[PDB]
Enzyme design. Sequence first.
Site, PDB file in Angstrom:
ATOM      1  N   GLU A 135       0.873  -1.162   0.000  1.00  0.00           N
ATOM      2  CA  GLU A 135       0.000   0.000   0.000  1.00  0.00           C
ATOM      3  C   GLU A 135       0.915   1.219   0.000  1.00  0.00           C
ATOM      4  OE1 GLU A 135      -1.545   2.932   2.433  1.00  0.00           O
ATOM      5  OE2 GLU A 135      -1.343   3.118   0.267  1.00  0.00           O
ATOM      6  N   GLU A 144       3.301   8.347  -4.850  1.00  0.00           N
ATOM      7  CA  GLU A 144       4.462   7.856  -4.113  1.00  0.00           C
ATOM      8  C   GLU A 144       5.221   6.823  -4.943  1.00  0.00           C
ATOM      9  OE1 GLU A 144       3.213  10.395  -1.141  1.00  0.00           O
ATOM     10  OE2 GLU A 144       5.106   9.278  -1.193  1.00  0.00           O
TER      11      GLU A 144
END
Lengths: 337, 337
Positions: A135, A144
């Site tokens: 995640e 990210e």
Amino acid sequence: RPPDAFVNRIDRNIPVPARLRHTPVSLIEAVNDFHYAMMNDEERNNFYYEVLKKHVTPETGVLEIGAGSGLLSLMAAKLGAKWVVAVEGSEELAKLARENIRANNMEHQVKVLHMMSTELKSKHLPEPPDVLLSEIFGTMMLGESALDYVVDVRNRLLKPTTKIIPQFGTQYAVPIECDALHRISSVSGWRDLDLKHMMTLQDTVSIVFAKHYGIRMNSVNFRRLSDPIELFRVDFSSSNRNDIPRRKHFDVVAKESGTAHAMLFYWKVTDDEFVMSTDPEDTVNNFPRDMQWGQALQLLDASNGPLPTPVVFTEGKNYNFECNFSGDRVILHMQLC
Amino acid sequence: RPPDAFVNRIDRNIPVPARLRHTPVSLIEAVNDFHYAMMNDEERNNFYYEVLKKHVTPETGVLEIGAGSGLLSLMAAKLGAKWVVAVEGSEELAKLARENIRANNMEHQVKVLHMMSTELKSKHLPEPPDVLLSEIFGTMMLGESALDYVVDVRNRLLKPTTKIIPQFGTQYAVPIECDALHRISSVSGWRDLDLKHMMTLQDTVSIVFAKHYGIRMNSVNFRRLSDPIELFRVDFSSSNRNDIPRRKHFDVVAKESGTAHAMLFYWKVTDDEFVMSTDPEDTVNNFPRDMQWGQALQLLDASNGPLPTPVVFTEGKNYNFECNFSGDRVILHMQLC
């Protein structure tokens, strides 16, 4: 005692309890800003549990990258995994993960490595994992660099039968009218005082997270002016950067008349029947998700004049947008053409 | 071309219009993050106009410190001031102020000096001003050192008849129960997985702005558990730091039973009959104020054990709090005793 102990930058007249005093400030900031919220996103937790539950057996080796404080690795262990390796680049977060593992008596099952996933090698694991778990999504899905980090591991450390969780991700945009947003991102004047020159500086380039405005989209009035635009979709088990063009064009049909103050960005990640979405429609009763991910916004300038020009939609008309991406595909921009 | 031109840190595949390209990024950030919101706080604008209107005549010399983009100085000029001097520490903000002044044809009336108010001397002004004007409040009232900066000028550059606008400021605190806040600042576990160790890191020291949580108090359910606590009040025409004790104690009577998750901080500034308040009760229909100032929060730990302890109020009971201040009185902390 760490050089960056929490107590250091606190005023000496202000009390700091023992539990906080000698903990690095970066860890306290990370946990307080992000980790409680993540751990209270009950739907995120249920999503990962259910997807994992379809794949984890006592013969399953599980690798988690970007493990953070380690909750998803705890889940894999809970489901009875053969072994779990959690990889976390932050030294302090890695130690925190180990504490949580200790707290749940899973030291024999879960090992945490302090390193970036890019430094991870075959020798660091007992064998190639049966499951790759992560995640590492941002407010922007790839914010990210999730695709880059998964691809790097996918290229090197897995085996043909490895299940990558989660499999699918789709990034969306939708043009919106939002008067509250407009009133904190524009100005015209005050009585007979002209302030239009301030508009020369309006940032119609940056993608900004709603959190950074102080705004929660589910708590202000906004109107979607068209059907969602699918910017791109990826399959984390097979996609690469070049599956996303560096430039795309979209024909957006206006379903409503109004001012497209901004493009609103949200995403949806799926694996089989399960879905993890940041569409505000799906987060009305998920305050922790809206605080941890929320949605992103880019103000729209219709042209390139000395002042910005409002993008005005009339119902039933076609609006062409050009979407440009950075090389890592993390940054994008939408421009009316 | 400035070293920090906006275009520099933008990806080369992403278009940037001419109006933004060679403008320093710090200016674009400041204006977009704060100035539009300030300029759309209609009540803040009306407050300053009305207070100024009571004092400005064609014989009035007006000094503004922390002038920013210059709106309040424009107001003084609008009201017919003899002269206006606006002082602004940011070079780019100072230039922006000059542009707004030019846009309203007030160059003959308003002069902007690029310097800190602490560097300002008698020779920089035509004469001691009749009015000292400022808006340098933070989310915490003294957050941007308003008292210190006013005192410095008050000590040196004014005359006995100088009117200081605004005159009064009061900082408040109130203990609140707020489940939404609690769910992004604490955790206990997920099913049979214990996460209580995460609570060792709970930051019950820092004052945090609601914006930083992503939260707007007017858009979540919260309960005030007592009458407001007046932390301190100042008269900007006469107060000094030592009018605020470095440590105070408060007896807070619980009017409700609940968990005091946090202390909520807000303030009220007044001058004669006019009031500028950040109490959420006064900002329900002032979205720009809530985005620019909002309110502040400090999580409460009832004790100093290895884990935080909830502050639990029972209606009708007395709760003693110790409030400690930094030397500049900008930072404070509330602790249950």
